[PDB]
Amino acid sequence: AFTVTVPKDLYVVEYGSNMTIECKFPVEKQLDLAALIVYWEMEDKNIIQFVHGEEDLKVQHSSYRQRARLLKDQLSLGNAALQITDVKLQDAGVYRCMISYGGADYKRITVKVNAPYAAALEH
Template structure:
């Protein structure tokens, strides 16, 4: 069974900071997770299956900047942590999850803001 999410989830992140793209699903075993950057032509951001991270097809510019919360995957948390956010990271992402009970896709719109201005005027 395929369960589409109704609306995209909006996330705002700041350049050079860490950011979490939320994604949840009905937990289970034999979990497959694929994170894809849709706006850039379906770039592979992060994959997880066979109970481990699968980064062979990961696009170079995401290398060493993505992670999942591995201890929470079985409970239905497929959120992606992205570190050192870049302007090019802005766009639409797809989180595809698959367990024995079915597949789910959710979409996240990532907006990237410039550096935070911490000076007091």
């Protein structure tokens, strides 16, 4: 019954701050890397790929360059936590974490961005 769970399926973040979004997956033992596949995505844009126990960014969408990282240490605890720094309005939307570690599952997370008079994104 391998299940990905999320403590929060909604995050409300203030423009310019850092954000950390969590997916949990069952991990009893010392973790078997390169048996673990973590894919994070927002709308249809890859943010993070983690396969063969190594970060893959060669598919990462232009936007998330230099602002997205997976907290690789939390993986051992069954926590695929995605940290986005310097949150933009374009970061508002639906995120998906897809995790394969024996079984496979996903959860969606909605991110909402509060912002000061952001004429800038309008255009």
